[PDB]
Enzyme design. Structure first.
Site, PDB file in Angstrom:
ATOM      1  N   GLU A  12      57.369   7.051   7.627  1.00  0.00           N
ATOM      2  CA  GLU A  12      58.260   7.697   6.666  1.00  0.00           C
ATOM      3  C   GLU A  12      57.501   8.523   5.643  1.00  0.00           C
ATOM      4  O   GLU A  12      58.108   9.240   4.840  1.00  0.00           O
ATOM      5  CB  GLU A  12      59.110   6.656   5.924  1.00  0.00           C
ATOM      6  N   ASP A  21      64.510  15.157   1.180  1.00  0.00           N
ATOM      7  CA  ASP A  21      64.466  14.591   2.516  1.00  0.00           C
ATOM      8  C   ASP A  21      65.121  15.521   3.531  1.00  0.00           C
ATOM      9  O   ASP A  21      65.478  16.657   3.191  1.00  0.00           O
ATOM     10  CB  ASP A  21      65.062  13.163   2.530  1.00  0.00           C
TER      11      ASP A  21
END
Ligand SMILES: [Cl-]
Ligand SMILES: [Cl-]
Ligand SMILES: [Cl-]
Ligand SMILES: [Cl-]
Ligand SMILES: [Cl-]
Ligand SMILES: [Cl-]
Ligand SMILES: [Cl-]
Ligand SMILES: [Cl-]
Ligand SMILES: [Cl-]
Ligand SMILES: [Cl-]
Ligand SMILES: [Cl-]
Ligand SMILES: [Cl-]
Lengths: 163, 163, 163, 163
Positions: A12, A21
């Site tokens: 991640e 994101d």
């Protein structure tokens, strides 16, 4: 030294400054969503409350690890309150538990709970059969590098895919 | 007569036979995901266990309402265990609670928890300000007919968007 | 080496054979309640299912530690879903977290959540003030040796009361 | 008209002014614990925050019903996150669900989860066998009038014990 923090750092990322994101939302650390508000100030306000510091939108690694552990605890609690996930989690060793938590970070408890055949295989210690099945999934097709590492973790019970 | 079942029937549909959702996964009732397994037999097995009957993949409305209430309870529990959602939910009336639960059905508790500014506005009874803000969101752009109905519910505190 | 397992071993005992707790109920390990049923066979059945082995009512230390960690996870999840406990837990270091978990083992999440003034003091890092207040409690009077050790842990942030 | 509020009003009382429960702790409404702090001011502070009003320690019936529903939701969520309770609750009708929630109000989710044989009987619709077993319990001996009403509710599936 490999562990769940280092695993999820690879999968991640570890980002010390607020960033957007893949859905355009302000995020920091190891995939930690701050807000869906389009306001960077709102994101900084949420961050400062969480950290207890005037961060200017930038945190330390140790602060990121604190947020990460909060997120791990939330994942584990969602797992333990889910009738499909709890018995699998109860039966797994630390490394395979990290693989299950990794899936929860990516798609949430309800998303992981959907893998009903593969979960049964894991509970039955049918590691390779579970892995072969998971590799056929839409999850795998969408994010094949991450899925392959997580699936290798289930197959082998080692951190080898992250070394 | 309008209520949360009838609201979510309009927004998510009421389907008595197993069908594939927008991500290709076997689903039934009011958006109830059965399995991510590509096997229709697996979906039927999950369904039969949940219902206690050999369904052949087809359920009754009352059975769908049972699954729906299970899903409502799961949504409410996720709300109550979420520090961003609980105080808002505690402060809301039945109709606006139904709107919040509706958002959880669509995107999950963590997804709804991301609306940090709008949630604060709801807690403060700033209905229209919350509604104007929510209409600017990626959620709205993606599913504008549903979002408009849910936002009208927050603005008005009535079932008018579903009549 | 001191840690939460060794702490709770001192406070709740580590018993490898089924025994009756202070309320007469079959228990094993570190205070792990097996059943309220008056049947020893029922207790053995619950134990064997939990452990995956035909135990005859006797477990190993490692098995006890597995059950203990299940119970720690349950305590942490109850803490995280409780509006009074979560912000305190989020603010505490590992040693003081162990003291809070210890209280949950003894009296449950709702019981610990009742210490509203002392919890506020802990969140504010007013360690001694919290400790002085907790020592005035019915909890302390009932179990003063354990409470004194837990309170010393909150005051000092060390394992000194268990050394 | 009988329902879970009226049931628990009979079993736990409905008290509109702060009072001390059987353990000496400040309580209001339907068994709602405000604080374990020995300070009446602390109890009034907790109450005023919960209600949103300067209550002077006295609430309305509607306010008590709001707190009661918060407590019912907490009980249901604890039930749904407990592997022993969830499948029983999922299988029960509304009236027997109220009996299970009633037990959670009295002793908490972990306490009710201890009745492993009786719970299995309820899941199997063996109502009278469950009732006969529950009447042999320490719970029954301690609070026999309440336990008899709750057990009659499990046996009959009606509100007859409360009429
Ligand atoms: Cl394993
Ligand atoms: Cl699967
Ligand atoms: Cl990938
Ligand atoms: Cl309102
Ligand atoms: Cl927002
Ligand atoms: Cl739409
Ligand atoms: Cl600290
Ligand atoms: Cl206190
Ligand atoms: Cl003691
Ligand atoms: Cl029934
Ligand atoms: Cl029993
Ligand atoms: Cl009684």
């Amino acid at each position: 030294p490999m562990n769940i923090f280092e695993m999820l750092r690879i999968d991640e990322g570890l980002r010390l400054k607020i960033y957007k994101d893949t859905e355009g939302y302000y995020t920091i650390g190891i995939g930690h969503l701050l807000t869906k508000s389009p306001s960077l100030n709102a994101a900084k306000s949420e961050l400062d409350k969480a950290i207890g510091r005037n961060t200017n939108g930038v945190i330390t690694k140790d602060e990121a690890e604190k947020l990460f552990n909060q997120d791990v605890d939330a994942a584990v609690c969602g797992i333990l309150c889910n009738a499909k996930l709890k018995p699998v989690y109860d039966s797994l060793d630390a490394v395979r538990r990290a693989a299950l938590i990794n899936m929860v970070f990516q798609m949430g408890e309800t998303g992981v709970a959907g893998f009903t055949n593969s979960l049964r295989m894991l509970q039955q210690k049918r590691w390779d059969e579970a892995a072969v099945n998971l590799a056929k999934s839409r999850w795998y097709n969408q994010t094949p590098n991450r899925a392959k590492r997580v699936i290798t973790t289930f197959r082998t019970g080692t951190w080898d895919a992250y070394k």
